[PDB]
Write a protein that binds this ligand. Sequence first.
Ligand SMILES: [Mg+2]
Ligand SMILES: [Mg+2]
Lengths: 614, 205, 205
Amino acid sequence: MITDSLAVVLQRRDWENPGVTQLNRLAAHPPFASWRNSEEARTDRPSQQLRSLNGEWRFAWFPAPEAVPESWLECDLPEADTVVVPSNWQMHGYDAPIYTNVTYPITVNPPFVPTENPTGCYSLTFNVDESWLQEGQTRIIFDGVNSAFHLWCNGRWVGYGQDSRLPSEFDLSAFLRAGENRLAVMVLRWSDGSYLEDQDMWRMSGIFRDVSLLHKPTTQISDFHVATRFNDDFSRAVLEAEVQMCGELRDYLRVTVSLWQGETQVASGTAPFGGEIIDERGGYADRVTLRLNVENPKLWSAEIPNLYRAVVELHTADGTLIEAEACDVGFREVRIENGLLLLNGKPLLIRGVNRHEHHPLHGQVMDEQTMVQDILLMKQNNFNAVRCSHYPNHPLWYTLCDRYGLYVVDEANIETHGMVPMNRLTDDPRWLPAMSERVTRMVQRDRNHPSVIIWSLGNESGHGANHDALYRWIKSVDPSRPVQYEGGGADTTATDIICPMYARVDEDQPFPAVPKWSIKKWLSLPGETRPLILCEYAHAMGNSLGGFAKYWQAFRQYPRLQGGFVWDWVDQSLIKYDENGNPWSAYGGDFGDTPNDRQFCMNGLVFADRTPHP
Amino acid sequence: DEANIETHGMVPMNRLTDDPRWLPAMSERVTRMVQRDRNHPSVIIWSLGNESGHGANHDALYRWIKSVDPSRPVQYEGGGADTTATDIICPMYARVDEDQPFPAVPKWSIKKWLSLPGETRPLILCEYAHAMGNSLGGFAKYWQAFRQYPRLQGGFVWDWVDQSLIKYDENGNPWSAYGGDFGDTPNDRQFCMNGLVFADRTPHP
Amino acid sequence: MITDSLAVVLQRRDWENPGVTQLNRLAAHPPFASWRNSEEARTDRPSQQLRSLNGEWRFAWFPAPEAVPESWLECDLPEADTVVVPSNWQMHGYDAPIYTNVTYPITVNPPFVPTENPTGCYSLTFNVDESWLQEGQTRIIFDGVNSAFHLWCNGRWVGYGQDSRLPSEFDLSAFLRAGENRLAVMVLRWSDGSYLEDQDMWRMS
Ligand SMILES: [Mg+2]
Ligand SMILES: [Mg+2]
């Protein structure tokens, strides 16, 4: 019909305009999946409401989005294969992936894209449950897409999304019906969001993470925050939690927050809705804040975990419960006082590594069995701090970085390392809305976890006014962690701890307008008090890590230096088969692309198997 | 000068400001002001908004003015007029000798503001001496304290011109109309004058 | 045609979504008006390039944006008066303006608006110069509209704007042609931008 024919969805193009970044999306929230009985919140058994949609799908490939036929949304075309999803369409043998270091693939001309976008068509037929259409809403969850995508449900239009790494969730309440249902998704290659991500990595595009479906009752809970505070002797502790609900309001609803450890319990609390007057008419009528207190805690550190367990549930006054969610919790406190990065009243010494998400066989897809070999092979070799570079990861990495013992540095999705000069798209304030939807929706996803201790804005994107604008927005809505930023010389107002890249130890080299002084010379300049943690040191391609012993004398003699991060952990290689069947590791631009850079894709501390370097 | 923000109806008055889903629509009314009015020699103080609560966004735009133009100060009123989003204190309707306490947003006395522990900034009033009907009584007591103390600076008077509308009878002679007499519901029926002169113009006493 | 029929401009509604605040707008700049010889910059004589379009226009009033007929953009309806522009349609005697102090006019429910928006239709026929279509671009400047508005040039679609007080400027380079030309503008009463302006004043549009 109209306007759900393909002649009217396409023009006017939404993937060329930086003022339209989304249509019909919901808010962000920490992941909870909403199981029903109160008992399984303590045991973390697999819930029955959360339903997964992995498996086999229908697929077809088109050279441009203007040549796709109109009869696709009615029934499936006879030319489709069967493709397992999640996967990229680059590795199956349709196109050739490209690799660059500093230059954009397409011609530089903002905000346009060329007229040959390789576009793809996915299709799926599924059955739905009978009772799910009677009451409540059924939320549909995409955890990954690259880069921009349109969606159709049963021959009608739903929405549109832009961002690549962070998830996207849609509402699908009144559309579907009993029995069988269709879903048709069209995926695009290049869009305006490609002008803000230019990391040193391979270039692939598709659906590469999980896809799931979820069910909620008509009254639900939406958000909740957990915060802790301490006295001076580390002997008495105060927990406070804030619970955000939604939907229909009544009077007789109650909440309950129970704190569990092992099998016994410690503290509990209930309260009804409403309170805490603020300026100046009234107070919030949808929130509650509960306070509990504990004696002699078991603290979280890098050496010993000592996790707790928390259950937050919503129930009536007699009464049967409706919802219960859970989040893990541990106790610590991070602060800067008099010029040292202090944790639990002790100075700290960081030794870490950068990690870049990659796999040789399946492309960008990460399974479960790889993330345990990474943490087990980091702990045995005396590391305790990992930096995710340069985008937020799968939502399961953090809880494996809770139970084992290492620190995590997190990052938004901004890099502009191609423009001339490198602060054109940042200082110009026409790009403030599209740039401030990649930092806000990170903090609301990753704020309950106990592992993250340092936020970071971006990397290699110059200096401007926007990086000063978002900085108070993190430092005004969460005051318990510091904020770090590198580019522009690593001295400016948009940071709190100095972080140069690739700074030497004794000699120094001057540049015009962005020097790199010596590491013992930074601290003695007139009017400088902050500490210094390196963001990148000791590049490691081929035979490298020479002169490494000279850093670890100065790291122990001086009081105020703190350590650094090592680039890089794992190689980025891809596999390819010959006529014999034997494989050989491929690198750079050998697939058949122009241009290329042909050696700067290894950066290896281990191989891609994994098997350790010397 | 001033941007275009007021949210004096919601419950509480920082719902649409603290929630960060409204940051793009709210940051297109301050940026496009500064690029229009920055060459003129008359404007000396920027101001963000009025009567819109306190939140994170009013801290977010503040460094954006103070990082692209450093030659003028920035002023903001709501929330108690003491917070981090301002540089000069500006309460509205603060008295001279007596004080009145409220929960969570007091209005202390004007000689008492400056002597609190850890306070150094000046004080320019944003609104004083409401002037509907016979008013401006007790006006002489402000202009003794404005000349004795060093660090007080003065204030702004609400309001200059009336807001009346005209309407014709069957005779042809006019009469000044006010409030909700056109035929609307609801209305407020006296708070539209606020006059220091009439609507002609012809001066009040 | 498609998509410049009125059945496809309206849904999906852009005046209910706080993520869409503009379509096809240019940057901001201090006002300069671009006269040609170097001598008149010192004397500030009236420039010849800057051309004003005040005067008389065609007008009609509709109770809701869903009942407007489709043959309006072809030729003008026979039921139009002649109205001098700039002016508000409240003072001519079509509706009744409203006044409040603290409460919103419509029912509080963000981000929606009710389904009876009083909408208006302006129309204008004008001649253009011959040499202006040969070289260079011809920028069109609106210095005020309340509140959200759509625009049509010669039966084709151009853009959409939201904000009330600050100006708005569009590009009109490749659309017009020699001789005579039409402009049809449709103005809306309430939109999402009404949830950020609540000053103590009269309510006109
Ligand atoms: Mg780079
Ligand atoms: Mg007010």
